[PDB]
Chains A and B, each alone.
Chain A
Amino acid sequence: MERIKELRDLMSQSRTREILTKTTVDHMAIIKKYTSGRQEKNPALRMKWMMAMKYPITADKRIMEMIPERNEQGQTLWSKTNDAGSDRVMVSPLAVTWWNRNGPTTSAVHYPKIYKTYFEKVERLKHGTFGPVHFRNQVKIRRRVDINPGHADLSAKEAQDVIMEVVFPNEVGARILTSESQLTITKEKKEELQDCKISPLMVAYMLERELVRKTRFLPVAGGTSSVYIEVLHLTQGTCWEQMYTPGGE
C-alpha cells in the first residue's frame, strides 16, 4: 500500500516525475552515486575536529519521534536541521548513548547466527590452548595463503548467485544453481535466516564473506592452515614462536 503511495506522491511533483520517466534502469547506479560530497582526504583530522561540535553525526528523520529533543538536564540530543544533500537530520553523539540506555530493545539472539565468521573466531579462540614460547630465529618466507577459514569452496561470482537466491529469491533471473553443494548451502542458510530482520544488504555481505574464498600473500613460518593464519600475529614473531592450537582442533 504505502510504497506505491509515495510513488504516486513523487510522480505528483513535476521534477521527480521527469526524473522517474526519463531515467532508465541502467543509470540507476549513476544517479544513486550522484553527490556533491567529496571523499575526505584526511578523515582523522576532521573526525577529531567535527566531534568537538554539537550535532556532529547524522541520523534518519525517525529519530525525532523515538528520542526526546533533550535529556534530563537539557542537553540537546538531536536537531531538526537536515543534512546537506539528504533528508537525514544532524544529531549529537549523546543520542547514541541514550539509545543504549533507554532506547527500544529487541531480541538479538539471531545476530550470532548472522555474523557467523566473527562468532566462530571467538569460539575458536576461547577454547584454544597456549604453550611455551620458544626463542629462536624464524625464517619467515612469503607465501600465498587463504585467510578466510569458512570459505565453502566458492568464488565471488560463484557464491553471488547463491547469496541472491538465499536473500533475494525473486531477482535471481535466469540462473538456477546446478551444483548440489550450492543447493545444500541455500537450503541451510534459507531455513536458518528465514525471519531475520537485520538487513538484506548486510546479510548478503556477510554471506559473501563467509562463503567466498579469499587469498592474500603473507610472510609465514610454519602453520599454513586457515585456522592457524588468523592468529599468525600471535603465534609467529621475529625471534619467538608461540605454540597454539585453536579450539576447533
Chain B
Amino acid sequence: MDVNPTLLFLKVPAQNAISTTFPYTGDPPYSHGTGTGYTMDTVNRTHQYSEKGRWTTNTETGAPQLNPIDGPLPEDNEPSGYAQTDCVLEAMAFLEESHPGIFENSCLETMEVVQQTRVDKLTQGRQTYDWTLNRNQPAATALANTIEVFRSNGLTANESGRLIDFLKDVMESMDKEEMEITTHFKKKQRLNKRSYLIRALTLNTMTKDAERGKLKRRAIATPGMQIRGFVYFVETLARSICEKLEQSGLPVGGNEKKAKLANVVRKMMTNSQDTELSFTITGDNTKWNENQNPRMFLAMITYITRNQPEWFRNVLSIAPIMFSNKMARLGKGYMFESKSMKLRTQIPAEMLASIDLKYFNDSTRKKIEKIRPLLIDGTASLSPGMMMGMFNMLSTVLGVSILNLGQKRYTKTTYWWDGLQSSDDFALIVNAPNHEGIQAGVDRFYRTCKLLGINMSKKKSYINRTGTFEFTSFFYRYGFVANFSMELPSFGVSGINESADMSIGVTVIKNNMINNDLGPATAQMALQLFIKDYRYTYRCHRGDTQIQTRRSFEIKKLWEQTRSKAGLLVSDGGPNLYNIRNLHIPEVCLKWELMDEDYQGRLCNPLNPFVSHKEIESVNNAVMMPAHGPAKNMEYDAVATTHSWIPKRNRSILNTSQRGILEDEQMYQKCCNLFEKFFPSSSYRRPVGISSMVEAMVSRARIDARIDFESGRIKKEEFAEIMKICSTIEELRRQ
C-alpha cells in the first residue's frame, strides 16, 4: 500500500482540511542577488501594456513618458492600461450619488489633519530612499539629512514644524538653479535643476524576499522623502473615504474582513428569491499595479476635492503629479563571473545605459535593449503606471466604485452584482434570473473593469454557486473555516528579547486559539514546543539538568541558591507553569508570589544596566512581519525585568566610508539624553517649540536650581554656582 495524503480530500471537504495544502513548515523562497532584472522586466511590461498610448518628452526632466489615457479601446482580453477619463469620472460621480456627502466630509477631515499635521509624523516609517546618499536609509535619518540640506541651501520654512511648510519648502526646492549635497569617501557637490528633479522623482527598487505562494520573484519600490508627505495626505483622504464604504476591506483587519464577507454573501443570496440564481466569482487581478495610471488618480482626487479650498486641491494633487513623472532606479546592478580567469565582478546598474551587451544573456540583452530608450541618468521613466501598491487605498476606492456601479440602479437589467474588493483581490456575488443573465452580468462587469485600467486574471479566477469561495487566504464554505497554516511561522521565538519572546509566544498561542480555532491539546503542544525551543535558543535550561552550555553554570548556582525554585523564570532556568488558563498572564506576575524576595529584588531592579527604554511608542510594541501579509505591530504584555535587554547592533558600519554617521549618532544621543534629563517628558510627549536646545536647558537650570533650593538639597553656594555656570555657558554660546 502506498500512502497518499491528498486522497484524504475524498472524505474531508477541501476547505475543512485546507491547512494540509500550505507548506509553511519549510524555508520560504529568497532572492540571492540583484533585482535589476526584475525591475527592468517590470518597467518594460508596464510600458508595453500601454504601447498604443501617445509618447511625449517632459520639458523639465527630459524623460520620455507614455500617456495611454483615452487611448484606443482594447480589442482583446490581454491586460490593458487604456483607462478612459470620462468613464472613471462617471464612476466616481455614481459613487458620490450612491453615498452623498462622502467626498465633502472626507475632504473636511483631511483638511483638518493636513493643516494640523507635524513634520515628525514622517519619521514613523520604514526604509525610505535618501537622495542625499542615493540609498535606502531609515525614515528618520533620511528626513534629517534632507532637512539639513534644505537648511544649508536656504529653505528654512520647515523650521515652523509643520508638514505643510516642509512640503512648501520641497516644492520651492524644485525651482532652484543649484543645490549642494555632501558626500564622504567630506566633499560638497553641486546638483543642477534637472539632476535634482530626477533625484526627487526617483524610486529605489529591491527584490522582495520571504514571499510564499509563487515560483518567481518580484520587485518592489521605495520612494524618497520629498514625495512621502503628499502620499501621506492622499492616503489619509483615501482611508477616510474607504472607512465610509462598506464594500471596501483594505483599511480593516482580518476578522472585520470575514464579517463583511459573510454579511455581503448573506445579503446577496437571502434577498435573491427562488427564481434568481446566484454565483460567486473568486477573482484576482493580473498586473494590478502596472495598469493603474497616476493621471487617473489625479482625476479621481480632483473630482473628489471639487468645491474645496484651492490650496487643499493643490496639496492633494501634487502627489499624483509627481507619480506621473516618477522615475525608478534600476537596482543594485549585475554580477559577472569568468571561470577561465576565475574571477567575479559587480557592475552597477547605472552602467546599463552605455555598457556593451556582450556580457548579457539573450533575455537580459533584449530587456536592456527595450528599456534603454527610457534610461535618463541611470534611472528609467515609469510614467504609465504604479510600481508597487503605493496608492493602495485609491485603488481600493476605484474597485469599490466598480463594485457599486452594479447596484441594479445603473445596470438597467435583471442581473446585478455586489461584493468586496481589497486591492489585487476580490469576491463578486452576481445574481440573475438565469444562467444567461449571470453570463451577461459577469461579461459587463469585466468590460467595465477593462474601461478603468483594471484587468481580471482569468487563470487565477473561477466562478461557482454562492456558498463556497475564497478571499485573501480566507476560505468560506457556508461559514469561514480556520486555516492555522498562515500563522504557523509565528509560533517560534520572535527574536526581540527573552521576556518579550516569552510574552509574544504565549500571546500568539492565545490569539490563534481565539481567532484561528486552535485546539486545546494543540495549544498545549505548541506551548511545550515553544518552551523547548525558547530554552534551547537562550541557553536557559531547567537548571536541574546536566546540559552543559555557556550559561549552565550561573543558572545552576542560581538554582541551588534559591529556596522556592518554583518562582524562577524560564529565562533563569526555572519550571514552566504556563497552561491554557495562564496564556494571558505575563511570566513575571504568574511567578511573583513564588519568587524569593532576594531574587525578586535582583530581577526587577530599576538600576539594572540592561533595561533601556527610548520612547512611548517602543515600550511594548514588537514589529513582526506576518507571513503572507504586510509588516504589522503587536502589543505584548511584559514586565520590565533584567531580561528586557536589547540585542547587539550590526556593527558593520565601521568598515564603510559612512563611518562618521556613528559619531553623529553618539553625539545626538548624548544631547538627547541631556535634554531628557532636563525635560523628563521628552519621550512620552515629543517637545514642541521654536527655541534652541541650550536656551531651554540653561533657563530650566536657572529655575530648577532656584526652586529646589526654595525646598530641597541645593544650597546658596550651589545655587549661585549654578547661576554663574549658566552665565558661563551663555557666554560660551556667544562665542
Interfacial residues of chain B within 632-646, with CB under 8 A of chain A in the complex: 637, 639-640, 642-643, 645-646
Q: Are B643 and A33 in contact (CB-based, < 8 A)?
A: no
Given A30-B144, A94-B554, A119-B592, the answer on whether A205 and B585 have CB atoms closer than 8 Å is no
CA distance in complex: A8, B604 (Å): 34
CA distance in complex: A21, B551 (Å): 47
CA distance in complex: A100, B515 (Å): 38
Give the interface of A toward B (CB within 8 A): 1, 3-8, 10-12, 15-17, 19-48, 50-51, 53-63, 66, 71-73, 75, 83-88, 90, 92-108, 111-112, 115, 117-119, 121-122, 125, 142, 160, 163-164, 167-168, 171, 197-202, 204-205, 208, 217-219, 230-234, 237-238, 240
Q: Are B589 and A115 in contact (CB-based, < 8 A)?
A: yes
Q: Are A99 and B608 in contact (CB-based, < 8 A)?
A: yes
Closest Cβ–Cβ distance, residue A17 to chain B (whole Å): 7
Q: Are B539 and A51 in contact (CB-based, < 8 A)?
A: yes
**What are 6 A-B pairs with beta-carbon distances under 8 A?**
A4-B726, A46-B495, A47-B494, A58-B612, A96-B571, A118-B585
Closest Cβ–Cβ distance, residue A224 to chain B (whole Å): 14
Residues on B with C-beta less than 8 A from A168 are: 680-681, 684
Closest Cβ–Cβ distance, residue B600 to chain A (whole Å): 5
Q: Are A58 and B646 in contact (CB-based, < 8 A)?
A: yes
B216 sits at the interface (CB 8 A): no
Of the candidates B603, B609, B671, which one forms a contact with A62 in the assembled complex, judged by CB atoms under 8 Å apart?
A: B609
Of the candidates B496, B582, B685, B698, which one forms a contact with A171 in the assembled complex, judged by CB atoms under 8 Å apart?
A: B685
B630 sits at the interface (CB 8 A): no
Given A30-B143, A85-B662, the answer on whether A3 and B258 have CB atoms closer than 8 Å is no
- Selecting from B358-366, B394-402, B418-426, B619-627, the interface stretch reads B619-627
Closest Cβ–Cβ distance, residue B669 to chain A (whole Å): 6
Residues on A with C-beta less than 8 A from B645 are: 57-59, 96
Interfacial residues of chain B within 6-53, with CB under 8 A of chain A in the complex: none
Residues on A with C-beta less than 8 A from B126 are: 39
Given A30-B140, A105-B602, A122-B585, the answer on whether A87 and B666 have CB atoms closer than 8 Å is yes
Residues on B with C-beta less than 8 A from A72 are: 553
Q: Are A108 and B684 in contact (CB-based, < 8 A)?
A: no
CA distance in complex: A51, B603 (Å): 21
CA distance in complex: A176, B223 (Å): 43
CA distance in complex: A6, B598 (Å): 35
Residues on B with C-beta less than 8 A from A15 are: 667
CA distance in complex: A94, B602 (Å): 14
Given A142-B255, A164-B684, the answer on whether A20 and B493 have CB atoms closer than 8 Å is no
B336 sits at the interface (CB 8 A): no
Of the candidates B159, B514, B539, B677, which one forms a contact with A232 in the assembled complex, judged by CB atoms under 8 Å apart?
A: B514
Q: Are A43 and B495 in contact (CB-based, < 8 A)?
A: yes
CA distance in complex: A63, B658 (Å): 30
Interface core residue of B495, B588, B643, B678 (most chain A CB under 10 Å):
B495
Closest Cβ–Cβ distance, residue B575 to chain A (whole Å): 16
Of the candidates A21, A43, A121, which one forms a contact with B693 in the assembled complex, judged by CB atoms under 8 Å apart?
A: A21
Q: Are A217 and B647 in contact (CB-based, < 8 A)?
A: no
Closest Cβ–Cβ distance, residue A160 to chain B (whole Å): 7
Q: Are B690 and A237 in contact (CB-based, < 8 A)?
A: no
Given A19-B671, A201-B684, A238-B519, the answer on whether A60 and B601 have CB atoms closer than 8 Å is no
Given A44-B495, A115-B589, A201-B619, the answer on whether A51 and B538 have CB atoms closer than 8 Å is yes
Of the candidates B511, B515, B558, which one forms a contact with A101 in the assembled complex, judged by CB atoms under 8 Å apart?
A: B558
Given A8-B729, A20-B692, the answer on whether A43 and B697 have CB atoms closer than 8 Å is no
Give the interface of B toward A (CB within 8 A): 119-120, 123, 126-127, 137-138, 140-141, 143-144, 147, 159, 161, 209-210, 253, 255-256, 258-259, 482, 492-496, 501, 510-511, 513-515, 517, 519-520, 537-539, 550-551, 553-555, 557-558, 561, 571-573, 580-586, 588-590, 592, 597-610, 612-616, 619-620, 623-625, 637, 639-640, 642-643, 645-651, 653-654, 658, 661-662, 664-672, 674-675, 677-694, 696-698, 701, 718, 721-722, 725-726, 728-729, 732-733
Q: Are A106 and B609 in contact (CB-based, < 8 A)?
A: no
Closest Cβ–Cβ distance, residue B172 to chain A (whole Å): 19
Given A51-B539, A118-B639, the answer on whether A160 and B685 have CB atoms closer than 8 Å is yes
Q: Are A59 and B610 in contact (CB-based, < 8 A)?
A: yes
Residues on A with C-beta less than 8 A from B137 are: 36
Q: Are A1 and B648 in contact (CB-based, < 8 A)?
A: no
Of the candidates A28, A84, A92, A108, which one forms a contact with B604 in the assembled complex, judged by CB atoms under 8 Å apart?
A: A108
Which 7 pairs show the lowest CB-CB distances between chains A and B? A43-B495, A47-B495, A33-B140, A85-B665, A105-B601, A63-B609, A26-B161
CA distance in complex: A185, B721 (Å): 40
CA distance in complex: A218, B147 (Å): 43
**Minimum CB distance partner of A214 in chain B:** B635
Q: Are B642 and A100 in contact (CB-based, < 8 A)?
A: yes
Residues on B with C-beta less than 8 A from A92 are: 550
Residues on A with C-beta less than 8 A from B496 are: 43, 47
Q: Are A96 and B609 in contact (CB-based, < 8 A)?
A: no
Residues on B with C-beta less than 8 A from A12 are: 732
Residues on B with C-beta less than 8 A from A4 are: 697-698, 701, 722, 725-726, 729
**Minimum CB distance partner of A1 in chain B:** B718
Q: Are B697 and A230 in contact (CB-based, < 8 A)?
A: no
Of the candidates B600, B649, B693, which one forms a contact with A20 in the assembled complex, judged by CB atoms under 8 Å apart?
A: B693
**Minimum CB distance partner of B623 in chain A:** A39
Residues on A with C-beta less than 8 A from B539 are: 51, 93
Q: Are B640 and A202 in contact (CB-based, < 8 A)?
A: yes
**Minimum CB distance partner of B139 in chain A:** A33
Q: Are B580 and A233 in contact (CB-based, < 8 A)?
A: yes
Q: Are B693 and A96 in contact (CB-based, < 8 A)?
A: no
**Minimum CB distance partner of B120 in chain A:** A29
Residues on A with C-beta less than 8 A from B696 are: 25
Apart from A19-B667, A201-B683, A205-B684: 20 A-B pairs, beta carbons within 8 A:
A7-B694, A17-B733, A24-B690, A24-B692, A26-B690, A32-B615, A33-B123, A34-B140, A35-B141, A50-B648, A59-B609, A83-B651, A87-B670, A93-B539, A99-B642, A100-B602, A106-B607, A125-B582, A201-B616, A237-B517
**Minimum CB distance partner of B726 in chain A:** A4
Closest Cβ–Cβ distance, residue A35 to chain B (whole Å): 6
Q: Are B585 and A37 in contact (CB-based, < 8 A)?
A: no
CA distance in complex: A23, B691 (Å): 9
CA distance in complex: A73, B556 (Å): 14
